[PDB]
Assembly symmetry: D2
C-alpha cells in the first residue's frame, strides 16, 4: 500500500554486513571498516551496571536524565577543559543519534536550510531530509582541511537557518582549528543561524594535531552534541548528551518526554562511573593503542603508494585518496574483500558527489589487524 515519501531516504551498516559474510564463508576477515571501538565499556562502568541490576528497580528516570550523570558531565567540562557549565544545560539523550533528533526538531521547522560539510557523517543528511529540512552540502577538500570556514558559510545563498559541524569528523578525522570554530560560532550568532556542534569524538585526538574546543567557549547559542559511544566505548549502551541553550530547554524537555520518555536508565546509572580516574585511564589506554595503530597505518600507506590523506587529527579513521588505483571506490572495496578479505569503507557512503575517489580505513582494532592488512594490500594493489 502506502509508503511515506519522506521515509524514502538513503540507508546508513551495509558494508558491515558484507564483512560478516566473509568470516562465515572464508574466515580470513581483517576488519578496518567499523565505525566503533573494538573495546567495550570501562570496568567501573560495567561494575556500576552490575551493582545497579541488584540495587535499582530500573524504572523510568526523569526525562532530562538523572541528576548524578548531569552533575558529572557538567563537572567534566570544568575539570578537563576549564569551561563552566550549569547542570541544567546538560540533557541526557539516547545516544548522540537521539540528541540529533531532539536538536533538529527543537531548532528547525520543515523547509529550513541546514548546511554541513561533504564528506561527512551520512546520517545528518538522512535525519534532516526525513524531518523535512533542506540539506545544503558544502563540498570540502584539502584546501580547507576538509572542514567548513566562516567565509565559506558567508558565501552561501539563499541564507541558512542552521549549520552542522563535526570536529573530529567522520570520515576524515580532521579537527576544526579552535580559531576557525570560534569564527564559525561568531558568524552564526551575527547571521542568526543555529550552530549544531558535533563533539562526539572529543577525547580522541593525536599528538601534533590542532587542539579541540567546545563551541560553548565562544557562543552558548550553539547546540553541543556529544556521546559515550566513542571515547568511553559505550557504543551499544545508547547514551549521550546535549548542551542546550537556555531558550531551547523547554522545547527539548517537551520533545524528549514524548519521543523517548527517558534515556536507558541502566546506561545512565553506569555512566556516572565513566568520570572516575580508573575509567579515564582505560579510555586513554584505548587512545594509546589507536596512536600506535595510526602510526603503523600512515607509514604503511605511504610505502604501498597511498600518500594523499585527510589530516588524521582525531577519531580513528584515515580518509584516503585512492583515485590513482581506481575510478570507482565502491568497486575497489568490494574486490579487496573478495580477494584478500581486508574490509574497508567506500567514500560514496560519506560523499555522493566526490566519494568515488575516496576510502575510509578504521584503526580502532588490534595492531595485528593493521599489520596483516598492510601485508595483504601490498601484495594485491600492484596488480590492479
Amino acid at each position: 500500500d502506502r509508503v511515506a515519501l519522506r521515509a524514502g531516504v538513503p540507508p546508513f551498516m551495509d558494508v558491515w554486513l558484507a564483512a560478516a559474510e566473509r568470516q562465515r564463508t572464508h574466515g580470513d576477515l581483517v576488519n578496518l571498516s567499523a565505525g566503533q571501538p573494538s573495546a567495550g565499556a570501562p570496568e567501573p562502568v560495567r561494575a556500576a551496571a552490575a551493582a545497579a541490576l541488584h540495587l535499582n528497580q530500573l524504572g523510568y528516570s526523569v526525562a532530562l536524565g538523572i541528576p548524578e550523570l548531569r552533575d558529572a558531565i557538567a563537572a567534566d567540562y570544568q575539570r578537563r577543559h576549564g569551561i563552566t557549565v550549569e547542570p541544567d544545560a546538560v540533557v541526557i539523550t539516547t545516544g548522540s543519534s537521539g540528541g540529533f533528533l531532539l536538536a533538529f526538531l527543537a531548532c528547525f521547522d520543515a523547509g529550513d536550510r541546514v548546511a554541513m560539510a561533504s564528506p561527512g557523517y551520512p546520517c545528518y543528511r538522512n535525519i534532516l531530509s526525513a524531518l523535512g529540512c533542506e540539506v545544503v552540502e558544502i563540498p570540502c577538500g584539502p584546501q580547507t582541511r576538509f572542514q567548513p570556514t566562516a567565509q565559506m558559510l558567508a558565501e552561501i545563498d539563499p541564507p541558512l537557518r542552521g549549520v552542522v559541524v563535526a570536529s573530529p569528523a567522520n570520515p576524515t578525522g580532521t579537527v576544526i582549528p579552535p580559531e576557525e570554530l570560534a569564527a564559525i560560532a561568531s558568524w552564526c550568532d551575527a547571521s542568526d543561524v543555529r550552530l549544531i556542534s558535533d563533539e562526539v569524538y572529543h577525547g580522541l585526538v593525536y599528538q601534533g594535531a590542532p587542539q579541540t574546543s567546545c563551541a560553548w567557549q565562544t557562543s552558548r547559542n550553539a547546540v553541543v552534541v556529544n556521546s559515550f559511544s566513542k571515547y568511553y566505548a559505550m557504543t551499544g549502551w545508547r547514551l549521550g548528551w546535549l548542551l542546550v541553550p537556555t531558550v531551547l530547554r523547554r522545547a527539548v524537555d517537551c520533545l524528549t518526554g514524548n519521543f523517548t520518555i527517558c534515556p536507558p536508565v541502566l546506561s545512565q546509572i553506569a555512566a556516572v562511573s565513566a568520570f572516575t580516574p580508573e575509567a579515564t585511564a582505560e579510555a586513554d589506554g584505548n587512545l594509546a593503542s589507536y596512536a600506535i595503530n595510526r602510526s603503523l597505518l600512515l607509514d604503511g600507506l605511504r610505502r604501498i603508494g597511498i600518500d594523499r590523506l585527510a589530516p588524521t587529527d582525531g577519531a580513528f579513521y584515515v580518509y584516503a585518496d585512492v583515485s590513482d588505483f581506481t575510478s570507482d571506490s565502491l568497486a575497489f572495496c568490494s574486490k579487496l574483500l573478495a580477494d584478500t578479505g581486508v574490509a574497508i569503507a567506500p567514500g560514496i557512503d560519506f560523499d555522493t558527489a566526490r566519494g568515488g575517489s575516496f576510502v575510509r580505513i578504521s584503526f580502532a582494532g588490534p595492531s595485528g589487524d593493521i599489520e596483516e592488512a598492510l601485508r595483504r594490500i601490498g601484495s594485491w594493489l600492484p596488480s590492479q
Copy 2:
C-alpha cells in the same frame, strides 16, 4: 532566538514531579509503570553479557536471537505464525512509534485516535507534521473506536488504537478490533495497533487479540516495558508489513543505529518459564490490587471497564485542582484526566501497580 514551531508541543510526568516534592506521607497511585523491575533471568543474562560481550552496535533491526524469540512467542502463546523478518527491535515502543509514523505517514496526513488516550501519540504526530484527528469516546461505546465511528469522519490516512489502553484499561473486543482492522484495509487507511499492555489482562472483561489475526497490513507496536517490567531498559518491537520493511530498516539505522544491545541480549531470557512466572506473578498482585480498588471506590462507581493497571471517572466533587489538593492535603497522588483528554478530562486515573498496602491506605 529561534525555536521551531513544531517543537512547541504539549509536555507528556508533570504529576510525577508534584509527588516527588511531597516526599507528607506519599502514597503514589499516579505512576505509568510497574513497581517491579526486570525478571531475574533477564538481569542474569545482562550480568553475564557485561563479562562475555563487547556490547558494540548490533545490526539495525535487532539481534536474530531476540527476533526469533518474539516470533516464536506469537505462536507458542497466541497461535499466530509470524516470520522473524516481520519483527523489528526498537528503542522502546516510543522508538517504535517514531519509526511507524515516519514510515507510514507524510506531513499533513490525517491520523485518528481515541480520546481519552495516551498523550504522546498526539504530540509525536503533531511534531512530525501530521494532522491529529481526536475521536471522543465515552461509556456509551467501548471507550474504543469502531469502524462505523471511523466511517463518519470527514474528510483519514491512519488510525491508532490501543488495547488495553492508557488511561482506561479497556480492551477493544476481538470482533470490534477485527472489524476496525477490516475497515482500514477496505478504506485504504493504515492501522497502528498499540499492543503494549498485552499480557496484563483481568479475569472476564473482553479478551485481547493481535491485529495480525485479521490483517497483516496493520503495524503492531509492543514493548518489554509493561508486561516484562523492563521499563528503563528502553526495548520494544514492531511487527512490520512487508511493504514497509525497507523504509523501517533505513529509518532505524539513521535515527537510532540500533536498540540498546545489553537490553537486547538480556531480553532473550524474558521468554524463559521462570521469567514468565515472575511476570504472571506481578499480574496476580495487580488482580488483588484491582479488586481492592474497585470495591473500595464504590464505597464512586462509574468507571471505564478495567480489562493494564489503571482505573479511569469522578465529576461530583469537581479534576486538575482536585488532584493537586488531595496531594497537598492527604499525600495520595493520582493523575488528572486533562493530561489524557483536553476536552472532557476535567476524570481521574488511578494506578494499582504498587503494593497492596498503598491501595488499602489510599482510601480516605
Copy 3:
C-alpha cells in the same frame, strides 16, 4: 597365575568419625519431592533467603573491578574494620580490628580455634544436645570430647556449677547461644559466670555466637563472651543472620596470646578466606542489608508464633525455649519410643520433613525432634494441618 594376599588398604582411625547427619536427612527429603512432590521441609539448618542485595551488588561489581587474588591471611582490612565497628555500634563493646580474624565460615574458624587452643588428648566439654560437628572436628583432631547432658532443668545450656563438678579437669569448654538445635540462649549472667569460671580454672572458652542477631521478643538478651572475659575465643559467621551460607565466610575474635598461632595456622591451612565473599561482606553492614536481615527475622517471628501455638494444639507442649536461631526442639516421647522412626514415618506418610534428635544427642535424642521455621509460613501452616491429621492415629 598365583593368587596372593593383598596388603590391607589403610584408612586413618581418626578419619572414622560420624557424618554430619543433618545432611543425610536433607537427602531423604529431596527424594520425596522427586517421587511424590508433596514435600514440606522443616528439616533445614539454613535460611531459605540468600545474601542481601547490597552484598550481591558488591560481589557483582568486584567481578569487574577486582582481580580476586589471594588476600592477606587474616582477611581484608575493610571487612575487619567493619566487624570491629559493628560490635561498638550495635552492642557497645570496643573491639580492636586486630582482634578480628576472617575465616572460611565458622567451620573454618572452629578448625583454627581448636588447633590453636588445644593439643591432642585435651579434654574439651560441650552441651548435649548440641551441634554435632564440634564433637566430630575435635575427635578427628585427637581431642577428648566431654559431653555435658543438659535438659529442661538448666534451659538445655551448661552452667558454671555444672562445669565445676566435672572430673578430671577440662582444658576447654564450647558453648553456643543461641544453640542448634534448641534455639535457647545462655542468659547474660550465666554466660558471664561460665566465662569467669573458665579464667579462674585456666580453661579455654570457645563461644559460638553464630546465631546472634536472630533472637525473639521476651527471650533472654544475647551477649558476647568478650563483655566478661577477653580470654575466650568468639566464633561467628555470615551464614545465618546475613544468610550468606554458601559464601563460606565468618570471623573469630582472637585473644592477644593466640593471634600469632592463628595467623600461622590460617596461612598454611587456608591461605586466605574467599576473597569475593570478603569484598561483598563489607556491604553487609549497610542500613539496607541490615533491614533485609531483620526482615528475614520478622518472617521467622511470625513463623515461630504459628509453630509454637500449633504444636500445643496437636499435643506437643514440652519444648526447649525458642529464644533464637530458627529451631524448635520438641519432646516427642509421649508419641514415640524412637524419634528416628517417627520422622521417617511422617515423611513417608505426610511428606513433612523434620530432623530426628539422634543427630544432636546420641544418648537422649530418641525422645526429641528438631523443627525448622526459616521457610515460608505456608509450609508451617500446611505442615501443622498434616501432622494434626496423622498424629492421633500413631
Copy 4:
C-alpha cells in the same frame, strides 16, 4: 599460664611475610617490581566471571552437597578424558575449598598422628606445617641438581624407618621442575608395593613449557594415590578458594564424612562459576596467560645468565625460577632484604622452602608483566657487581 597449643607452634607460611615487605616499599618508595608472588597476576576467565554474575541473580547460594555440585564433578571427570585420555568416574572427584582444603582432607583421611610422611626439600612449606600441626612425622628428602630437585623411587626405597606416606609435586613450588612420567610411575608403583600412600600434588598442571618433560597424572599408573589439584593457578581463580581431589574408592567414605563436618561444602558461587572454566573461551584465556609466561620465562632465563646467575632448577612448569645465588651470598634472606631496600625488586628467599639448604637459594616469579621482568633485570645488573 595462658595456654597456647604446642602443635599450633608451627612456622608461618613465610611467602605471605615477603608479600608484606614488598607492600611497604610501594607505600614508602613507590618503585616496587614484584617477582615474589605465588599467584597469577591475571584473574578468573571471563566465562567464569559471567557464570558467577548470573548465579548472583538466579541462585540462592545456599549450602551445596558436601562433595560438591554434580555439574562441576562431571566437568572435571570429563576434562581428564578430553584432554589427557584417562577415564575418571564423577564419584572419584571431590570438590574442596582450594587444594589447601584438599590437603587437610587428604592428610586426615590417609594418616594418623605419628605417621611418617615424606616430601622433597625444597618444596611447598605448607605440607610440612599442615602435617606437623595434624601430629604427623615429617620426613624431609633433600633433593638437588643430581636428581632434578625431585625424589626418585630408589631414594624412597633407601628411607628407614618405613614411611606411611609420600607427597610429590609436579610441577613444584619453588623449582618449577616436573617429575618425568617414567619416574612418577616408578614412584607410584613403589608406593603400592610398599603399602605407602601417595599424595600427588598436580596443582600446576596445564602450566608447562616447551621442551620440558611431559606432565602425567598419578592415576595413569595407580589409583591408590590421592590426586590434589586446584583452580587457583592454571585457571587463575586463586581467591575463589576452589579445588578438587581424585579420591581412591577405599577413602571416599572417610573424605565425605570429614568434609561435611570440617567445611560443610566448598564455596558455592565458586562451584557454579567453575563449570564455565571448561569452555573453549576460558581455556583460550588460560592458555593465553601461559603464552605470556613463556615469553617472560625466556626473558628471565636469558637475562639471569648475562648477570651471572646460571645454576637454576629446570623451569619445566609453574611460574618460578629457583636460582642458586651462593656465589653472591652466604645468606639468601639477607640478599633479598638488601635488594628490596636498594633497588625495590622483590624476590623470595629459599629459606621459606628449605630450612637446611635454602640460604643458597632464591625464588623468582615471572607471572607478572614483561616490563617488570625487564626492569628487574636492569636493576639487578647494576646492583649485583658491587655486592
